[PDB]
Amino acid sequence: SDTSGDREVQRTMMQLLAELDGFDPRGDVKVIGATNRIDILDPAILRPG
Amino acid sequence: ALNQQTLAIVNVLPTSKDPMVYGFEVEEKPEVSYEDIGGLDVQIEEIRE
């Protein structure tokens, strides 16, 4: 909290968590995520489901 | 709702402004439904109450 470059990139993060599956399915994605470390990866992504 | 060729009130329309996807939508369909109530049982019951 209290950042001016690490809060809007978290508010687009949150938007994803949350359009991927939620109210409305899936569709047929199956979203291939790719990253490097898990230590600059939010755990919400990193838990399976 | 007005006839713009005369400028005169034709009908009166409900106040609602411009409501899109926003709040309007109501669904509830599968795969998460009220059959998918396997939890976390204490938590669910609290919501019903």
Can you describe this structure?
Chain A: This is Proteasome-activating nucleotidase. Chain A: It is found in: Cytoplasm. Chain A: Belongs to the AAA ATPase family. Chain A: It comes from Archaeoglobus fulgidus (strain ATCC 49558 / DSM 4304 / JCM 9628 / NBRC 100126 / VC-16). The structure is cut from a larger assembly and holds 2 copies of chain A (49 residues). Chain A has helices spanning 13-16, 43-46. Helices cover 16% and strands 0% of the residues of chain A. Chain A is mainly alpha-helical. Chain A starts with 12 loop residues before the first helix and ends with a helix. Chain A has 2 helices and no strands. At the A-B interface, loops of A face loops of B.
**Biggest sheet details of chain A:** none
User: Outline of chain A, from the CA principal axes?
Assistant: globular
Terminal-residue CA separation of chain A: 27 Å
Which structural class fits the helix and strand makeup of chain A?
mainly alpha
- How many helices of chain A in DSSP terms? 2
Strand content of chain A: under 5%
Rounded to an integer, what's the Rg of chain A over CA atoms?
13 Å
- Helical content of chain A stands at 10-25%
Instruction: Find the count of extended strands of chain A (DSSP E, 2+ residues).
Output: 0
Assembly category: part of a larger assembly
PDB class: hydrolase
Keywords: AAA-ATPase, Archaea
Entry title: PAN-proteasome in state 2
Chains A, B: Proteasome-activating nucleotidase
